[PDB]
Design a binder for this molecule. Structure first.
Ligand SMILES: [Cl-]
Length: 147
């Protein structure tokens, strides 16, 4: 029975992180974006959640996470998004000491016009489609201008 810690997730955005959804502390880590030259159209990236409350997910019963890092793979051909791994971090922005549930299950899904990340994914793939590389500066401005 741990007490419930309320956090002050920073409203200031750390450089390199791009807000994915309007007024939500959910970001794409721009340094994570990668596409293999043998599998074009498949974008690998990490999404990062800054928490409002601490998550007690460490061996040490009193330590809590402040953020979540989710490794994902977006297929711009079919708009299938695969969730590969979820890790918990004790600092904001998916940094610091990590804790993870052991041996995790990958899970794919199809982004429909009524899906959450459909808007973001559409912006990511459109940006990627112009050069078969992501322009991080254009992506930030695209996601910012949409919001
Ligand atoms: Cl910064």
């Amino acid at each position: 029975e741990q007490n419930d810690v309320k956090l002050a997730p920073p409203t200031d955005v750390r450089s390199g992180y791009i807000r994915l959804v309007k007024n939500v502390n959910y970001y794409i880590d721009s340094e994570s974006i990668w596409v293999d030259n043998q599998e074009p159209q498949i974008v690998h990236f990490d999404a990062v959640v800054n928490l409002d409350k601490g998550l007690y997910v460490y061996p040490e019963p009193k330590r809590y996470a402040r953020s979540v890092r989710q490794y994902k793979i977006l297929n711009c051909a079919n708009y299938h998004l695969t969730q590969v791994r979820t890790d918990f971090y004790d600092e904001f922005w998916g940094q610091g000491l990590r804790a993870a549930p052991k041996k995790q299950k990958k899970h794919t899904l199809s982004l429909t016009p009524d899906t959450t990340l459909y808007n973001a994914a559409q912006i990511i793939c459109a940006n990627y489609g112009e050069a078969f590389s992501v322009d991080k500066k254009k992506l930030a401005a695209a996601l910012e201008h949409h919001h």
